[PDB]
């Protein structure tokens, strides 16, 4: 047969024309996200910078970034309905099985995630009233990517080899709780006490909400006629987005921002290759 | 037949004996009530009353309510599977119908909904160091009930008459993320705009979680040194519980703790009754 | 503020060390929080720990089980025992005033050297 | 969070500008005290939030810096001055002080 190319070429373009030929899955999980994209824009229509603004921008960030993760939830489905023709086209030798992974990510995966993360910072981004910048915006854009391809890359590590939907979708939703805990937002990940605190570091939403509040607080200011730079006799203010910042336990400089994507990427490489043993380690069991 | 306590006392024999003879659906949920109660336990333990008081009492009750809410999912269950057993024995006539749902009610939710709550506040109430009172622990009790009461009420609401669990699981999921926002933490209730703040009222882990961090609250203090009773130049602070309660829009008086009791119970009756009136309105469907 | 604490100026090792610093001034339980630091001989440091006015404490985490602090309301003290000493702990000990609405440590005690030795 | 006083000495003559540099090992985000021990005394506070200072002091004095970079600034460096100043984190408990930097005349 071909070598690489033309076979995920091929193979992708079935998949990808299947996700063309099926608007279920595809165009019920857009209008999900776009009116869900349009309540979270109502709710939290046009954040201010006073004292209740923080736990306002912190909310809705949380969300994002946790939506996104059990948004992940729906790629379990992606391997293991098709188990029974994967099994099938690979004992009769249709593919290369590296051929057969990157295509179908390339089929569903890829684009799929692409669209509530477009969708969501655009049509949240300005109904919010976030950071003006293009750049910032760029940055909550790629960020809801990575973190949307890392959850999934989860769902796939865990997914991937199974013939049951449900005792991997039970499994994954605990593992998204657990996660959960460990994001910014509901414990203080710094008061830990730290023979478990080492652990924040197996959680999936502390790295795209810790961007997400990185690159949108960074700038800002929270409490109204007090500029709170070298700030006297309020302390205890939390009167910036630095003292929000450094109080939750993120690093400030900017590579604390990009370290977030680099331990995202990680975690896609290293979950996809753990799907990739299991296929190539259960592609004969059949 | 028997008028009316003789047969609700037999089949609430027949399925409590049931409930008793399965011990899958029981003692798994115990047993993640149990570890997931200790693992709150290790993580938040011992709650200090410093700057990152506040986040840390109002991410654990946060959790606690809501994590309520998605455990009546499993409550979703117990009607839809014994449909065809429901509508054979009503067909046949063994029972009148508000005998067999106050006698399933009595057998599966009323038992079952305790033991998370129970086992809940003794684990983790001490572990945390929540307040030493006793009756305090008793409002968090009869609190962690009642929203499993009610969030399983609202599960059974929408969830009877209907002979497929999936559709009717995504649609309790998506009604409990909209009324997750609509809580104390993630959106700051006090600054809705007014033309859909009204739904508040809608949400019931905004009735959990505003009782249970009434109780909870309330006598605290949070900034270490700071006595905060007429507070100066420090405002902005945060440094009582009381300032977290109005801050967050919740009422101070003792009435105001009790009527998310009332509420609460009125969502019970009010979706028990719209289960009921499903069951007399589809018992000769069939 | 004014704060002054007295004790031995000795203890025997392996044991326990008491110390007291009467307050004048404020109530121990109206406004700040109460604080005890220790200081190496020599130079360094050390924060060891205070109790507020609502009676809750809090400690360095290097003197864990072997501090501990008390409050006496009616005269305006409140006390360290420190159990289980060593030579190290042969050090000056201060009592010392913490705003917290202003975070620094805004008065200090006048201080006691503290010798443990056999 | 370690703080990192380097160095710990100095010998600069009277009347003089001498520049301390605390280092903190995280972000503490102007939350730094610098106190001013004599010999034989209690550390009294000197500049509180990093640039204010309390009263009771020449106003010689000046602190300045953020991020991690934290200095206290003396104009005019008089006899009074000399002593020892630690540097002093109060962003989040423990407290940890810094070395201490002994000056000295020249």
């Known amino acids: 047969t071909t070598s690489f190319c033309h076979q995920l070429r091929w193979v992708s373009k079935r998949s990808f024309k299947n996700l063309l030929g099926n608007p279920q899955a595809s165009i019920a999980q857009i209008i999900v996200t776009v009116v869900l994209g349009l309540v979270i824009g109502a709710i939290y229509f046009g954040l201010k910078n006073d004292s209740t603004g923080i736990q306002n921008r912190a909310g809705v960030l949380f969300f994002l970034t946790t939506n996104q993760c059990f948004s992940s939830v729906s790629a379990v489905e992606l391997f293991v309905v098709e188990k029974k023709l994967f099994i099938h086209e690979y004992i009769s030798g249709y593919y290369r099985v590296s051929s057969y992974f990157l295509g179908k990510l390339l089929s569903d995966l890829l684009p799929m995630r692409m669209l509530p993360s477009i969708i969501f910072t655009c049509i949240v981004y300005f109904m919010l009233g976030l950071k003006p910048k293009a750049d910032a915006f760029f940055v909550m854009m790629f960020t809801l990517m990575m973190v949307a391809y890392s959850a999934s890359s989860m769902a796939l590590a865990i997914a991937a080899g199974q013939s049951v939907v449900s005792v991997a979708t039970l499994l994954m939703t605990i593992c998204f709780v657990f996660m959960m805990i460990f994001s910014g937002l509901l414990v203080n990940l710094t008061t830990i006490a730290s023979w478990l605190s080492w652990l924040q570091y197996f959680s999936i939403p502390r790295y795209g909400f810790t961007a997400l509040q990185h690159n949108e607080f960074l700038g800002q200011n929270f409490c109204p006629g007090l500029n709170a730079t070298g700030n006297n006799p309020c302390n205890y203010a939390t009167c910036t987005g630095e003292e929000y910042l450094v109080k939750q336990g993120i690093d400030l400089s900017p590579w604390g921002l990009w370290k977030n994507h680099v331990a995202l990427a990680c975690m896609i490489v290293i979950f996809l290759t753990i799907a990739y043993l299991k296929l190539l380690f259960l592609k004969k069991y059949s | 037949t028997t008028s009316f306590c003789h047969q609700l006392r037999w089949v609430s024999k027949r399925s409590f004996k049931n409930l008793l003879g399965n011990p899958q659906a029981s003692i798994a949920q115990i047993i993640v009530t149990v570890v997931l109660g200790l693992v709150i336990g290790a993580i938040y333990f011992g709650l200090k009353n410093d700057s990152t008081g506040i986040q840390n009492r109002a991410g654990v009750l946060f959790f606690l309510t809501t994590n309520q809410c998605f455990s009546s999912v499993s409550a979703v269950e117990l009607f839809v599977v014994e449909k065809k057993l429901f509508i054979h024995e009503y067909i046949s006539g063994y029972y009148r119908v508000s005998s067999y749902f106050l006698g399933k009610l009595l057998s599966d939710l009323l038992p079952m909904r305790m033991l998370p709550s129970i086992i809940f506040t003794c684990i983790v109430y001490f572990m945390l160091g929540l307040k030493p009172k006793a009756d305090a622990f008793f409002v968090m009790m009869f609190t962690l009930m009642m929203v499993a009461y009610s969030a399983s009420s609202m599960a059974l609401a929408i969830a009877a008459g209907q002979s497929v669990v999936s559709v009717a699981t995504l649609l309790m999921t998506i009604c409990f993320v909209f009324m997750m926002i609509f809580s104390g933490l993630l959106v700051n209730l006090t600054t809705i705009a007014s033309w859909l703040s009204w739904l508040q009222y809608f949400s019931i882990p905004r009735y959990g979680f505003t009782a249970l961090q009434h109780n909870e609250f309330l006598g605290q203090n949070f900034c270490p040194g700071l006595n905060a009773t007429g507070n100066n130049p420090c405002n902005y602070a945060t440094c009582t519980g009381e300032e977290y309660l109005v801050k967050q829009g919740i009422d101070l008086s003792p009435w105001g703790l009790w009527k998310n009791h009332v509420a609460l119970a009125c969502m019970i009756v009010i979706f028990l009754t719209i289960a009921y009136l499903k069951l007399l309105f589809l018992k000769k469907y069939s | 503020v004014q704060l002054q604490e007295s004790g031995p100026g000795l203890v025997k090792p392996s044991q326990s060390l008491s110390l007291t610093c009467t307050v004048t001034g404020f109530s121990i339980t109206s406004d700040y929080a109460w604080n005890w630091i220790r200081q190496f001989p020599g130079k360094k440091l050390e924060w060891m720990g205070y109790?507020?006015?609502?009676?809750?404490?809090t400690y360095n985490p290097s003197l864990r089980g072997r501090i501990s602090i008390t409050r006496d309301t009616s005269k305006n003290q409140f006390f360290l025992q420190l159990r289980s000493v060593t030579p190290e702990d042969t050090a000056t000990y201060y009592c010392?005033?913490?705003?917290?609405?202003?975070?620094?440590?805004?008065?200090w005690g006048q201080g006691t050297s503290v010798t443990v030795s056999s | 969070i370690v703080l990192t006083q380097s160095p710990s000495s100095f010998s600069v003559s009277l009347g003089d500008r001498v520049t301390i540099s605390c280092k903190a090992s995280g972000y503490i985000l102007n939350r730094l005290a610098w106190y001013q021990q004599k010999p034989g005394n209690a550390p009294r506070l000197l500049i509180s939030?990093?640039?204010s200072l309390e009263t009771g002091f020449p106003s010689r004095f000046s602190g300045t810096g953020s991020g991690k970079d934290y200095t206290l600034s003396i104009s005019s460096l008089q006899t009074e001055d000399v002593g020892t100043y630690y540097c002093?984190?109060?962003?989040?408990?423990?407290?940890?002080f810094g070395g201490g930097t002994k000056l000295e005349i020249r």
């Open positions: 939030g990093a640039t």
């Open positions: 109790i507020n006015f609502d009676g809750g404490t």
């Open positions: 010392a005033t913490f705003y917290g609405a202003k975070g620094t440590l805004d008065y």
């Open positions: 002093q984190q109060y962003w989040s408990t423990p407290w940890t």
